[PDB]
Design a protein around this nucleic acid. Sequence first.
DNA 1: CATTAGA
DNA 2: TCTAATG
Length: 327
Amino acid sequence: ETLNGGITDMLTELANFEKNVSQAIHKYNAYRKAASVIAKYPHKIKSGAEAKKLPGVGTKIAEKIDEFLATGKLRKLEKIRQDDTSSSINFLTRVSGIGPSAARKFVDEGIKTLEDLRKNEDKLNHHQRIGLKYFGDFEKRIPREEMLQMQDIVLNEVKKVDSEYIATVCGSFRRGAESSGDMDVLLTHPSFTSESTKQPKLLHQVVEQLQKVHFITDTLSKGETKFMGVCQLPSKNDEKEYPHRRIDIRLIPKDQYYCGVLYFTGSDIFNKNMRAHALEKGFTINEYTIRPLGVTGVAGEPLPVDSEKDIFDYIQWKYREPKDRSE
DNA sequence: CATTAGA
DNA sequence: TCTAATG
Ligand SMILES: [Mn+2]
Ligand SMILES: [Mn+2]
Ligand code: NA
Ligand code: NA
């Protein structure tokens, strides 16, 4: 956690580099398990050899550990850190839409800078277009203060359309969080559960509504159950316009809300920790359900959930407020 | 790990 | 279809 720190960190640095700049999924996969194990290791690793004893620890990596333990650096990390080509890949990547794959390609063609990205907006697909467009706005944290106004509106229209809808803004915002990256809204309706062969419109109507009023400004991706866009709070009575925010709403079979909800609420750890528990408690939890465990090794049979509570009860735990789902 | 664009 | 990008 801090004793193995640099090691895991140069290691991660290393891995990440192969996967993006290089198309070396393996080496990349190498660095990670290694980075994974030394990480767990209970003592200050003192030399390659020592490290080497570890599963996933090759001669390759071990050697890197030495140079790093010896000199508080690494040539390969320095060389990369410098590499203009590799720098560029790292960056274009920021654009919502641009992945490594396209990052290389662009680079090759010569789009290194943001401005390049501009002159060639043509080479970019709609996602990346918008990506490039709200580049600033996108990189900005979301004050809860705004999250409150946002949630407010979504909630309202959702309701105006059909009072029957249920909505939850999940994520950290739900979890107290002073700020948020983007807004996650989970949606479901009663007329839409496990079987009941869809009702695409279900999503659709709402999207239409939010746009109707100008909350949604653009569509990144809209499918029958997952809409992904851009929004913005009404820039008041001028002088102060609001930044464009990433928003995502998804339809959910009413019969799998709370789990899904439980789930997306986090935290990453509270979840795992929660999950790890239901296990002992004779269960199984996952993004949509909670099945009672059987001794033959495994088992099925989706237990009925009416609220975050039920889930808790099941595994017989103490209801934890979002606020304290911290871990 | 499953859902969308796109080619 | 597969392959990328998001989450
Ligand atoms: Mn979020
Ligand atoms: Mn998110
Ligand atoms: Na070994
Ligand atoms: Na990106």
